[PDB]
């Protein structure tokens, strides 16, 4: 029903923030149609757009430059880790794993808004491809951001494994 992206650490067993935007950067190897990947990576608790996703870039022609995505609709992101600390020093109860939750259709409906806006910036003929990051730093491949004061990185992939039009 909903998606669950795997995460690595702690310490907040709450967060429950909203997605405001996302950091994108395309690479070489055009072939026939353009493919884009995320590179930081996502924005949280910022400033959302008025009506529909507002997209701009430093240099649209240049592949090496970052592309800005400012969404209109806030995408809910519920994050947790094993909480029970009452017994010292080891944790007790459910160990599960560190994870962040999003609704399957909610993200897909927000992704299609980006897709339609991505068609008009390249003169239609849409064949939008979402693939994994190139690399560089461990903070680029695993979404490094702030939530609840602290900075923590964890893998997505499950979030950008779709091809539109």
């Amino acid at each position, epitope marked *: 029903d909903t998606i669950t992206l795997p995460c690595r650490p702690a310490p907040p067993p709450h967060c429950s923030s909203n997605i405001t935007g996302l950091i994108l950067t395309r690479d070489g190897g055009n072939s026939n149609n353009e493919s884009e990947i995320f590179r930081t990576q996502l924005l949280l608790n910022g400033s959302l757009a008025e009506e529909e996703v507002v997209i701009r870039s430093v240099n649209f022609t240049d592949n090496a430059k970052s592309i800005c995505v400012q969404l209109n609709t806030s995408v809910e992101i519920n994050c947790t880790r094993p909480n*029970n600390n009452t017994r010292p020093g080891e944790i007790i109860g*459910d160990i599960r794993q560190a994870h962040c939750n999003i609704s399957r259709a909610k993200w897909n409906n927000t992704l299609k808004q980006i897709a339609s806006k991505l068609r008009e910036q390249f003169g239609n003929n849409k064949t939008i491809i979402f693939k994994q990051s190139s690399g560089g730093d461990p903070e680029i491949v695993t979404h490094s951001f702030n939530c609840g004061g602290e900075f923590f990185y964890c893998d997505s992939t499950q979030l950008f494994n779709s091809t539109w039009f």
Partner: antibody, heavy 135, light 106 residues
Framework: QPQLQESGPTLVEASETLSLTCAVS??????????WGWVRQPPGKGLEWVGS?????????????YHNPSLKSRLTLALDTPKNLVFLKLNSVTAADTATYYC?????????????????????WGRGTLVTVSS | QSALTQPPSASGSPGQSITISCTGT????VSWYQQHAGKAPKLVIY???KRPSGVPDRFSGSKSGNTASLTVSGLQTDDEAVYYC??????????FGGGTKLTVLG
């Protein structure tokens, strides 16, 4: 040291509600490491699991209760954390329910679990008492 | 209803070693119990291979494929009892075998 003490009516009548109470001594029912429940055995027949519980909860519940699917319909399992008592209520009894009811302390994959706790073995037992159902 | 497949009876003489089977256990949450006639059951093994407190080393756990096995080596008068096997099932349910009836000859 740890001792489980069964108590109740040794002779319940047909179609009535069978009731039994365990008196734990040497362990706390509040403790997160195990589940508490019962196991019945008919006169000269195999060991039958009855069911078990533990108040130790997660973010989505207020404890855990597990039943034997067939006995589910006619049973209630209870825990008196401070009075250190375990309870069994079995309504509408037949001569098929005549058994030596044992008070069981369940161990297994309880304390630290994934998704839910898996209790799998009766580590500490009670002396047991024979209930006789009659019409 | 659903039960673990344990042979009905078994025998050995004092000094000899008996090995009794149990089938239906796909996991490792396998346990063995000792029942003295005119008494309550005592656990003799859990987690396949592990013995509880003050339980001799002669009582042993094994599990190949779907079959669990207890081995009583060096039988004695006090070994004559009914041995049940047990395992977790499905989500959180628990099953017991039919129990093997052990007899010390002589």
């Amino acid at each position: 040291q740890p001792q489980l003490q069964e108590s109740g009516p040794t002779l319940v009548e047909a179609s009535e509600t069978l009731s039994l109470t365990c008196a734990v001594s040497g362990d706390s029912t509040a403790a997160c490491n195990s589940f508490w429940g019962w196991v019945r055995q008919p006169p000269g027949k195999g060991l039958e699991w009855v069911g078990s519980l533990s108040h130790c909860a997660s973010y989505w519940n207020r404890g855990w209760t597990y039943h034997n699917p067939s006995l589910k319909s006619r049973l209630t399992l209870a825990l008196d954390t401070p009075k250190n008592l375990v309870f069994l209520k079995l309504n509408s009894v037949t001569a098929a329910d005549t058994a030596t009811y044992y008070c069981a302390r369940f161990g297994g994959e309880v304390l630290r679990y994934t998704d839910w706790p898996k209790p799998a073995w009766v580590d500490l037992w009670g002396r047991g008492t024979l209930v006789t159902v009659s019409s | 209803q659903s039960a673990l497949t344990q042979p009905p009876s078994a025998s050995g003489s004092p000094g000899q070693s008996i090995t009794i089977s149990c089938t239906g256990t796909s996991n490792n949450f396998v346990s063995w119990y000792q029942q003295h006639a005119g008494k309550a059951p005592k656990l003799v093994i859990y987690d396949v291979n592990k013995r509880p407190s003050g339980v001799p080393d002669r009582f042993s756990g094994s599990k190949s494929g779907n079959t669990a096995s207890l081995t009583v080596s060096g039988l004695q008068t006090d070994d004559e009892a009914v041995y049940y096997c047990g395992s977790l099932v499905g989500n959180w349910d628990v099953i017991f075998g039919g129990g093997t009836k052990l007899t010390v000859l002589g």
